[PDB]
Ligand binder design. Sequence first.
Ligand SMILES: *[C@@H]1O[C@H](CO)[C@@H](O[C@@H]2O[C@H](CO)[C@@H](O[C@@H]3O[C@H](CO[C@@H]4O[C@H](CO)[C@@H](O)[C@H](O[C@H]5O[C@H](CO)[C@@H](O)[C@H](O)[C@@H]5O)[C@@H]4O)[C@@H](O)[C@H](O)[C@@H]3O)[C@H](O)[C@H]2NC(C)=O)[C@H](O)[C@H]1NC(C)=O
Ligand SMILES: *[C@@H]1O[C@H](CO)[C@@H](O[C@@H]2O[C@H](CO)[C@@H](O[C@@H]3O[C@H](CO[C@@H]4O[C@H](CO)[C@@H](O)[C@H](O[C@H]5O[C@H](CO)[C@@H](O)[C@H](O)[C@@H]5O)[C@@H]4O)[C@@H](O)[C@H](O)[C@@H]3O)[C@H](O)[C@H]2NC(C)=O)[C@H](O)[C@H]1NC(C)=O
Ligand code: COH
Ligand code: COH
Ligand SMILES: *[C@@H]1O[C@H](CO)[C@@H](O[C@@H]2O[C@H](CO)[C@@H](O)[C@H](O)[C@H]2NC(C)=O)[C@H](O)[C@H]1NC(C)=O
Ligand SMILES: *[C@@H]1O[C@H](CO)[C@@H](O[C@@H]2O[C@H](CO)[C@@H](O)[C@H](O)[C@H]2NC(C)=O)[C@H](O)[C@H]1NC(C)=O
Ligand SMILES: *[C@@H]1O[C@H](CO)[C@@H](O[C@H]2O[C@H](CO)[C@@H](O)[C@H](O)[C@H]2NC(C)=O)[C@H](O)[C@H]1NC(C)=O
Ligand SMILES: *[C@@H]1O[C@H](CO)[C@@H](O[C@H]2O[C@H](CO)[C@@H](O)[C@H](O)[C@H]2NC(C)=O)[C@H](O)[C@H]1NC(C)=O
Ligand SMILES: CCCCC/C=C\C/C=C\CCCCCCCC(=O)O
Ligand SMILES: CCCCC/C=C\C/C=C\CCCCCCCC(=O)O
Ligand SMILES: CCCCCCCCO[C@@H]1O[C@H](CO)[C@@H](O)[C@H](O)[C@H]1O
Ligand SMILES: CCCCCCCCO[C@@H]1O[C@H](CO)[C@@H](O)[C@H](O)[C@H]1O
Ligand SMILES: CCCCCCCCO[C@@H]1O[C@H](CO)[C@@H](O)[C@H](O)[C@H]1O
Ligand SMILES: CCCCCCCCO[C@@H]1O[C@H](CO)[C@@H](O)[C@H](O)[C@H]1O
Ligand SMILES: OC[C@H]1O[C@@H](O)[C@H](O)[C@@H](O)[C@@H]1O
Ligand SMILES: OC[C@H]1O[C@@H](O)[C@H](O)[C@@H](O)[C@@H]1O
Lengths: 553, 553
Amino acid sequence: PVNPCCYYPCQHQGICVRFGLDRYQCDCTRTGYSGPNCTIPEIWTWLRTTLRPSPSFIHFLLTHGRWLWDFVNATFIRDTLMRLVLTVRSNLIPSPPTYNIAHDYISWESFSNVSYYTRILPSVPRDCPTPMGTKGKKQLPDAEFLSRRFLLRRKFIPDPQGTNLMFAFFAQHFTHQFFKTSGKMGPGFTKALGHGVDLGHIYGDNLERQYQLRLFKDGKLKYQMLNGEVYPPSVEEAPVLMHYPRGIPPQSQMAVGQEVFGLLPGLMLYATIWLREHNRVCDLLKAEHPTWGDEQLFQTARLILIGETIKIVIEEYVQQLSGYFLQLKFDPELLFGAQFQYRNRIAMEFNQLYHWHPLMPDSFRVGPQDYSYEQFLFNTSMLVDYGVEALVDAFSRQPAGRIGGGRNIDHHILHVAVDVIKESRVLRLQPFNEYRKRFGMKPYTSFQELTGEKEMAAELEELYGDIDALEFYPGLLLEKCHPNSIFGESMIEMGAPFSLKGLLGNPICSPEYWKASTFGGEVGFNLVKTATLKKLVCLNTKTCPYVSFHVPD
Amino acid sequence: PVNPCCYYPCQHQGICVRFGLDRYQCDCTRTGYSGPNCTIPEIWTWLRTTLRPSPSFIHFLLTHGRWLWDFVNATFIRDTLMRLVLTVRSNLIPSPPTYNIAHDYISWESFSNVSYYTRILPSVPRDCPTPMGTKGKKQLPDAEFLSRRFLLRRKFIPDPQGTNLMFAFFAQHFTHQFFKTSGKMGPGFTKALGHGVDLGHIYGDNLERQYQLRLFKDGKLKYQMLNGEVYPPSVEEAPVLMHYPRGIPPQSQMAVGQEVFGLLPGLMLYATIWLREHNRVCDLLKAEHPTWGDEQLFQTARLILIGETIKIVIEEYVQQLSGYFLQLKFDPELLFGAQFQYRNRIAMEFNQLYHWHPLMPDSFRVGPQDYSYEQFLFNTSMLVDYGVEALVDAFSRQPAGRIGGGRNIDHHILHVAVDVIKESRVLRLQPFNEYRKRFGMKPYTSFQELTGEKEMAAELEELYGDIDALEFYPGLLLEKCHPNSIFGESMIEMGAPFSLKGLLGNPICSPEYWKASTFGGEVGFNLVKTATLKKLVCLNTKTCPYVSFHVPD
Ligand SMILES: *[C@@H]1O[C@H](CO)[C@@H](O[C@@H]2O[C@H](CO)[C@@H](O[C@@H]3O[C@H](CO[C@@H]4O[C@H](CO)[C@@H](O)[C@H](O[C@H]5O[C@H](CO)[C@@H](O)[C@H](O)[C@@H]5O)[C@@H]4O)[C@@H](O)[C@H](O)[C@@H]3O)[C@H](O)[C@H]2NC(C)=O)[C@H](O)[C@H]1NC(C)=O
Ligand SMILES: *[C@@H]1O[C@H](CO)[C@@H](O[C@@H]2O[C@H](CO)[C@@H](O[C@@H]3O[C@H](CO[C@@H]4O[C@H](CO)[C@@H](O)[C@H](O[C@H]5O[C@H](CO)[C@@H](O)[C@H](O)[C@@H]5O)[C@@H]4O)[C@@H](O)[C@H](O)[C@@H]3O)[C@H](O)[C@H]2NC(C)=O)[C@H](O)[C@H]1NC(C)=O
Ligand code: COH
Ligand code: COH
Ligand SMILES: *[C@@H]1O[C@H](CO)[C@@H](O[C@@H]2O[C@H](CO)[C@@H](O)[C@H](O)[C@H]2NC(C)=O)[C@H](O)[C@H]1NC(C)=O
Ligand SMILES: *[C@@H]1O[C@H](CO)[C@@H](O[C@@H]2O[C@H](CO)[C@@H](O)[C@H](O)[C@H]2NC(C)=O)[C@H](O)[C@H]1NC(C)=O
Ligand SMILES: *[C@@H]1O[C@H](CO)[C@@H](O[C@H]2O[C@H](CO)[C@@H](O)[C@H](O)[C@H]2NC(C)=O)[C@H](O)[C@H]1NC(C)=O
Ligand SMILES: *[C@@H]1O[C@H](CO)[C@@H](O[C@H]2O[C@H](CO)[C@@H](O)[C@H](O)[C@H]2NC(C)=O)[C@H](O)[C@H]1NC(C)=O
Ligand SMILES: CCCCC/C=C\C/C=C\CCCCCCCC(=O)O
Ligand SMILES: CCCCC/C=C\C/C=C\CCCCCCCC(=O)O
Ligand SMILES: CCCCCCCCO[C@@H]1O[C@H](CO)[C@@H](O)[C@H](O)[C@H]1O
Ligand SMILES: CCCCCCCCO[C@@H]1O[C@H](CO)[C@@H](O)[C@H](O)[C@H]1O
Ligand SMILES: CCCCCCCCO[C@@H]1O[C@H](CO)[C@@H](O)[C@H](O)[C@H]1O
Ligand SMILES: CCCCCCCCO[C@@H]1O[C@H](CO)[C@@H](O)[C@H](O)[C@H]1O
Ligand SMILES: OC[C@H]1O[C@@H](O)[C@H](O)[C@@H](O)[C@@H]1O
Ligand SMILES: OC[C@H]1O[C@@H](O)[C@H](O)[C@@H](O)[C@@H]1O
């Protein structure tokens, strides 16, 4: 007897539950609807859903009124929107968290075992007809094929939005503090507990590793002068795990906090920048608090980075991405009047979704030189040869690639893409259209509609046989982008919620923590309140190069 | 130069912070006050603090209007108060949590290292003149002396409030799921992570131990028929740690979830009762969901106990304790309109405070027999010899001891008391009066005032030299009780906040979780909504004995 929940009869976030041998029931509790499948709108929901404009429309206003916006920007109407932006977006992420790779239901285990990534939608029942549930073919497209055929870059397509490489890496770096899938435990698990912006990719993810990195003096971190400039320490001083290739594990084999940060200069660059910051903070703190110990100078300075980070990530990172005229803003107080849980738990869908590998170029331009992946990957001196000033200047100038539209992932890393598709299936993530709903959108009625064109569209149907069958990662990357956008609708509408629920759900953002005493002094609080990419750099370098999340000119 | 924060210059929860070599500053942020030490009430605080009646007064109304209360009880005015009761009481507990045994400031470490118990007030600076800070003698009273002289029971003083032993144990049992100080790590640390009502004293506190206890079939737990009645399994089947004395580790050496539950029949009794429940729940669930696996039948049934527990603990446990005419009530929805964090973290002060050892009798009456501690402690067959029905009936009839008033802890366990006093000092908990403030009360101006009498009072002063110097545990137990109360003012006013913040801050209490689907079915939800002590027993026994949290007649 077919598992009814295989059809996903419940609507609007109604919980599907098997009763007896062949029946089911939806728990439409607090879903705003009632009825067998949560299909009958309560008096207000009805009002709500009739007056609610399309997401497509909002993205429009947000990206057009270049006069009305400068006005809105200069007035309170700004925080109003920001506050609105937040609350509404974050309301879509269950918290306390729901299910994981092991439980398609609420459980104490799911709640407390920080190891499991968490999922938004349950998984595709292990007993459903098709791999996606009801519709599709008894076999999903060969992921190796799908990759090359639709995600493989032909000619490099740059981000119309002007994004650069200085951004591309910051992105990669930044995301690796919460995305750390444990190979040992397998997909659906993570080493990066904490699940947020704890910078456990600087201070490592365990107390020891931290201690191995901590110079237990002046709250500072270990480091080593090369060329007269500051850099991270090598394992010989910072005796901690890494993944540098078997070759020269002594010198140039720097310790950082994120195991894999030796594998690319980009990551290491930032690693250096932050470390040089932390210690910089300590120098400031210690002058304000001579009577202070080490443990303090450390923890306090930490929080000052968990702040600075959350600030730049919002008023600069997401700003660029958005393409909004509305000037996003980070002010924890905007939620002090709302019902918000200051707690996060990274999800698998969020993980998948953030696989923006196509941002990567073809080669890497550094002034006149032009390193190829071979010269770049695992290189180990570019950083010290060239220098932060110079390297940053070089990334802040080379365009990054459009993330959506399809076919723009360089071939070298195209393997990642395939794995995600393979992993997803292991994870048993519901179909693209299913996630469209859960994130307040309408399911696409055809590939022709999904993709703005007709070619891929037609061929994809030939493959999945039914648009519903379509999968998560592929749909996201193969969806048509908003005009001149770095990517399409589904990315923003599924990303921002995960993205903000996580940014603001950081304890330091709570009323309890958001005090100038938590950053010991007013000086600390300001560093947080006035952080900038331009300052995260030029305040830790000899000279001030060009740095931004977008190309100049 | 004396560490200024040694005087506790900041008021109303203002954070004290050292600046330079000899100065300090208070962070009166969101404290309702402003000024050098948070001593100048904002316009409303002033209104608030002038119109706010004394706690002594409230306890009065709550304990007198036996007509107006039956009326309030029969109307909505009930939930209004309940909601009021909650929110206000819970607002006094910082969340996300603040400090721990290692940090007297906010830190990422403090936030995430679930191992550290957390503290409400920072600790007494390791560089202050007196052990308590400013006032007192360079040496605290000899804890062994203090014990015998003021906490040692002379003549057994029963709880005027009518409390019985059926309650005394439930209490002990129940509290040991969140109070588990790790001897290895020392004071200020805990094995019981989760920090709440997760029943990790039934299902143990680690996945393995759980699995060793789990009968991986029908979601049920292992057990063994003795006399035809159900009991927990012995290590031989449930190969898990315990602490039964080196003697007969095979039979009668039952596994439970809480290492130390073999050490007293009382604890084991309850252990049996709950287990017999869980499996009982499973039987109900499995009939409603034949198509269900084991992992589910398990987790679901669990939550149904995390519910039932939180229900009884509130509408019966705290009810008895309170002595209120207001009929306390458990309905998670009452907070769905408030700003509440569904997260808890047990504190050291809460731990200390809950050391209600004087509830314990002199001997233990069981029908005509009358076991003494020697026959009772570590006994190992009383339970199976006598039986749940009978044993419960026997506890529900023997009075428990008044908790406050001083001098009423039986001699056998009087050692615990001394340790707490010794531990506290290791912990460096601020003075009694200091905690009085933090919990919205006025500091006592004399021992004569603390204690309703004159004898102890006079002698205690001779000891501490200054009422301020007075300590936490002693003050709590030596404070005069409200007339006919089981204990005094400070206990309720410091306990309820910790107690409720914890009860309601349970994830299952959130809007997200509080659905009938989380307890799979309506049947589950009702078991939670209608749990009773009388039912936790008589629905898992052959006959229905006398059971209540208070003596009959
Ligand atoms: C978060 O959640 C993950 C799980 O999803 C946790 O990691 C996993 O943890 C489990 C259990 O700790 C582990 O178990 C695997 O299952 C094997 C099966 O074990 C056998 O079958 C039962 C189960 O107990 C027993 O009856 C068997 O008999 C044994 O009984 C004796 C009693 O002392 C044993 O001493 C003797 O060995 C005997 O055989 C037997 O145990 C288990 O044996 C095997 O070790 C295996 O590991 C998973 O492998 C863990 N790993 C993962 C990623 O799944 C993780 O710990 C959780 N995080 C936290 C912090 O809680
Ligand atoms: C919650 O918080 C508690 C701490 O409050 C955690 O438990 C404690 O964890 C610490 C660190 O893991 C542990 O450390 C103790 O300190 C000893 C000092 O170590 C030496 O001094 C420094 C510190 O790293 C090093 O420079 C020394 O040199 C070493 O460097 C080599 C590098 O590989 C080493 O291999 C070699 O040994 C060399 O000596 C040296 O390490 C430490 O050595 C000792 O082991 C000791 O344990 C505490 O003891 C832990 N226990 C407690 C209760 O305090 C707990 O883990 C946290 N919980 C979680 C989950 O995070
Ligand atoms: C938007 C962020 C971002 C960027 C710019 C990026 C850029 C690059 C890059 C360019 C120099 C290379 C060679 C790689 C190479 C890899 N990446 Co990423 N990755 C990124 C986010 C991720 C994530 C997320 C994972 C999955 C594992 C995890 O961390 O949980 C990942 C995994 C991988 C893996 C392991 C297998 C797999 O999961 O498919 C390889 C190899 N990569 N990555
Ligand atoms: C109100 C609950 C309660 C009760 C009724 C109770 C009843 C009894 C009892 C009567 C039969 C005996 C013989 C003991 C004996 C002990 N108890 Co308690 N204890 C209780 C709550 C605690 C707590 C809390 C601790 C501290 C350790 C922990 O669990 O964190 C404790 C600790 C102890 C210790 C270890 C040393 C110490 O911390 O002082 C002994 C021995 N006991 N206890
Ligand atoms: C790693 O990067 C360095 C640059 O820091 C590479 O060396 C440069 O190579 C180019 C041509 O490939 C020369 O024209 C530059 O003069 C070199 N820089 C210097 C002074 O060394 C190096 O080849 C890279 N190694 C790898 C792994 O390919
Ligand atoms: C443990 O408890 C049992 C009761 O279950 C004790 O045995 C009883 O002892 C009394 C007198 O002490 C006798 O009058 C009862 O008849 C006994 N019950 C039976 C039938 O065994 C036993 O003595 C206790 N053991 C310890 C540790 O003292
Ligand atoms: C609720 O969801 C079910 C599940 O798809 C809907 O479908 C069932 O009933 C339909 C009405 O005739 C049939 O077309 C389907 O065969 C049948 N399928 C299943 C899985 O039971 C049901 O109609 C929905 N009800 C509402 C209110 O739309
Ligand atoms: C704020 O707290 C300090 C700390 O006790 C108060 O005391 C300081 O100033 C007093 C005023 O003369 C002196 O009596 C104390 O010697 C001095 N002690 C310290 C620790 O500095 C201070 O007066 C308080 N201010 C207010 C507004 O009451
Ligand atoms: C969990 C830590 C933070 C993780 C997220 C960080 C960056 C996320 C990347 C992209 C987010 C969505 C992109 C579009 C933003 C739209 C903003 C809005 O319209 O609201
Ligand atoms: C953390 C899990 C729950 C821990 C607490 C359980 C029981 C606590 C014991 C006593 C609490 C305070 C006693 C007085 C109650 C007054 C109620 C009120 O006036 O508000
Ligand atoms: C026009 C923008 C007004 C201020 C922000 C309103 C909320 C924006 O945020 C998001 O907008 C999406 C539409 O694109 C909706 O689908 C989301 O539910 C909503 O949270
Ligand atoms: C500010 C102008 C646009 C506002 C309308 C955004 C659409 C409302 O957003 C909806 O809010 C519900 C909250 O009850 C969520 O449960 C829904 O999933 C979400 O789509
Ligand atoms: C008279 C009771 C009215 C309904 C409950 C009001 C809040 C009760 O709760 C508590 O009462 C104490 C007084 O004893 C106060 O000190 C606490 O701050 C308050 O939270
Ligand atoms: C319902 C009748 C009694 C209500 C008055 C209770 C006294 C108010 O309670 C106060 O509330 C503050 C919230 O801003 C807390 O910070 C204080 O610590 C607390 O004592
Ligand atoms: O994208 C769909 C369209 O929705 C409409 O509401 C807007 O006016 C258009 O600007 C937008 O392109
Ligand atoms: O306890 C102090 C006293 O406070 C007064 O407000 C009440 O009317 C008394 O009943 C109470 O005993």
